[PDB]
Design a protein around this nucleic acid. Sequence first.
RNA 1: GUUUGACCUCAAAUCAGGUAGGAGUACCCGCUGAAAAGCGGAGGAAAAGAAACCAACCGGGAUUGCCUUAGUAACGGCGAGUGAAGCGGCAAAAGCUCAAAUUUGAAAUCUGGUACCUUCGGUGCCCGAGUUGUAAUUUGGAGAGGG
Lengths: 176, 187, 248, 341
Amino acid sequence: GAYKYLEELQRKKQSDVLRFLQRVRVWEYRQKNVIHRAARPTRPDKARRLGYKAKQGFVIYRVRVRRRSLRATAEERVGRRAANLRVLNSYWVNQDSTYKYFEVILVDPQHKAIRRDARYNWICDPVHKHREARGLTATGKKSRGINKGHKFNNTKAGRRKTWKRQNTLSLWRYRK
Amino acid sequence: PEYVRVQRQKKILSIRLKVPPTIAQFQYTLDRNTAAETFKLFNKYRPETAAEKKERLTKEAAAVAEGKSKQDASPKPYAVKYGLNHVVALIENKKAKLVLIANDVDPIELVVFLPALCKKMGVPYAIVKGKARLGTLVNQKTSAVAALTEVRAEDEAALAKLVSTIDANFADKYDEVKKHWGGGILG
Amino acid sequence: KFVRAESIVAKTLATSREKERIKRVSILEDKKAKNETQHIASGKDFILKITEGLIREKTTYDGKPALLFIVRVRGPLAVNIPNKAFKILSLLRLVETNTGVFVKLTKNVYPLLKVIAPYVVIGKPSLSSIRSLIQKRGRIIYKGENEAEPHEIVLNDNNIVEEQLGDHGIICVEDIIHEIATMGESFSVCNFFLQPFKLNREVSGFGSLNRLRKIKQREAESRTRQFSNAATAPVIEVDIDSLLAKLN
Amino acid sequence: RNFITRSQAVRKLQVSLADFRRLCIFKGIYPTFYYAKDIQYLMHEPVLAKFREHKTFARKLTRALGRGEVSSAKRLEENRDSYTLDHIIKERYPSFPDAIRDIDDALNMLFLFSNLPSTNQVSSKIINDAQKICNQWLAYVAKERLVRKVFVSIKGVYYQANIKGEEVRWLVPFKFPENIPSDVDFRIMLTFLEFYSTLLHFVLYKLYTDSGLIYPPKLDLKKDKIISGLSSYILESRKYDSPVASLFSAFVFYVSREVPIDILEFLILSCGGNVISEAAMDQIMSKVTHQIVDRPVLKNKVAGRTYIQPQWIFDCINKGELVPANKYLPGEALPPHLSPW
RNA sequence: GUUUGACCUCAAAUCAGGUAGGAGUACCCGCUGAAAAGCGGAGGAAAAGAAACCAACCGGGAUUGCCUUAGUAACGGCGAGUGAAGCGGCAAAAGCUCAAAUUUGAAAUCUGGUACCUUCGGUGCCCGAGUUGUAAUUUGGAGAGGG
């Protein structure tokens, strides 16, 4: 398939053709709004490996942010704007000195293709409301820093959690 | 309006700036009569529509429903091939006898390797003008690629001379200017 | 205009085919009429009858004066019409297509039918059809009251009719129908008198719906009309009672 | 609010203007100054919906042609609904004698289109349906043999029929090739045509079922090849009012080839007598007593056979009674006929 | 061909169907933050969760929580004091899905409308969506083609 070509070509960003397309598209998107709807993913392979499918119930927004993180704030903007949609994920496409550009995949839990088709029906659950608001996305888990490793220690929110471990005292019926 | 303003300001900012030579291979494309005969070729090899498919299915199914199991014989379907990953899939065997490549795709990067890929695989590619005209011959809105592998014996001699025609008209004419940086002249 | 490179070739090939079949017709009919049947295909002639793959029955030709109605068809695809057939269609006034005429069939008439076969369509007409053609269509070139006189008038006045046809005593255009059907005394008087015929095109064409009609009719005409080019071509006859239901 | 501009109504209905012209004529909606409540009535109508569907259908046909896919266009044309006219015919004319009252204008157009030659704007199929329905209408009259009134004119042949109430005043112009007028527009008369065609169609249904015989009339094809008339149709099974019906009972005519066969044929069929024309004979005479002919010199001059110029039939039926035929003998001059109007 | 049409984009709909907001907020999750307040987002739990793990052993084996590790390691004007984790015992235990090479001998996929039916739906038909990829199969513990 052709996706391996797109990925390997995508890894060479400062190559002449990609910076050409980047330099055209940053001006072209600069013409448009801060937030708008893209007809199709400009980086389809990246959208696939983030989970995009080309059917009804998949909405692609393109979002502009000024230079929390920038990516998570970009997700929060389209989460606030299209509340009926659930945010699947997001990825970088383009940037300027003034703005970075992100391309965000959102999924509607109202469309019957999404309400059926059991690979994706889990996102219809109301526990998946506003994953970007709770940092439950990929960039949210990265900025929370949730993995396995000794490199991963008590960091910020978990720090208050282990402050909570220092703040509360546990007593049994029979004192130990 | 805004969108008219942008779609007129588009293709100005492109030509004003230096395009890389892996682009502008597009619009160095096939001329009038050769694209015309290429379309006359591929309309001989239209794929079956969903209606024609379902119609033949109902015919043979009513045959088996009577039963009236007539015979078990059909040579093969021959048609154009149009799925992009399927088109790339027919290369790297190789199976593509001819490939048509649309010049206009908005994610151009879907397409840019295909001339070099058919160049190295030796596949007779040709850059066609307009993916809508590809979609018309393949019952889609757009197609952006058009591979053709299997040809009847009635058409095989026309195929080879079309290949030689394209390799004369495309590979000889535009090969050196393909290497050159296009555009760059202001508007 | 720059015409093209292909049409000039296709016309040449089609004229080559037509000149070849016309020379074959001319040589074969010369050997028949001169009665020197030594090494030819067949001696006697044949007639096709297409009715309703559809049933196509052949007859031998009968040397009998038969009333025929001819209908000019648009000729084949890119053909320059040759001067021999141009001469005949000039005599029979069949240029400016969709134009029939009533004709007498004899054995002196018959050989030209093999010639102009790829440009017209033939059959046995009925009295109601002849009647409908004459009562609904037909104009007569006419010397009138005070005219520059390329002047044609539709068939209303039977007294204009019995004016110029009083010598044969022919009145009342119904009788012209009757004597074209009859041909007992004089057909050719009525034949030169009714000199133009015009028929409408069956499909208006340009527009979304009527292109479908045009394609279906081109397919139907491909099924009906057959181009033998053998010089022993059986004369194709079609239901003019079916045809005039379309064109009139 | 009483008057609405045609542009306003045509944009509120979201219809094309020519189809609005269809609908106003079609439902009898009358005035660029139109009643608001009549447009409110028009505002929901399935025929309007099928008109808009036909617009979208032709648009899909244009994309089918522009993509060149012929077979999908064939599928579209075959799988296509047709708007009918019939429901507003019934809710426009519920009472069947009101249809009998308003069939009078409906006949006249269809007879004129049955006379009309084939053109580009008017299809032959239109003219075929017109001539078929008009021959059916004449063939129904010759069953009960009930008209009474006859009129001979430079403008038309006006017959009114005494059928189930009113006498109905239909006219046929003579079967002559007419120079077409460039001044007229067919686009209105075709709408009147189709409306009157469907209306007279169901009225012929009730008149054929009410007369107790089969509504599709069968014809012998070779009888039609003789003559394309009402006499082509055979009329199945599943008294006459005196004197005009069964006037000239047991009476055998010999109409010539000279005479106009059509209206004299229909008058003899209104009489019930027989028709023998030599014009029918040459397609291919024991009881014949009477020649209808208009010729100065009569050849065989049979004293047994009565020689009559056709006004005798035109005057006998206008009187309902027999008159002497010395005036109608050729070449005697005729009374200037002034019909009973 | 000054015509016609494919697209593509962008508008408009008193078009059809849906959905967002607010309250509460004990518990949860994010953001901000002083000498907590605040903000945003959910649920009956939430979060986390099936190793780019821990170990150095005769190795262990998703996450979660309890006891122990332990007031230890480590940090800290090594001052004030701050303050873990592996292992072990227990509670509970459950694993799975995509994205990469073609179905090309037939987009096999689905929304919607309509007609019926046994209606958290089913069947048929028709618009659409979709090859700039929807289905089946395959997630390394391999797997696929065949035999």
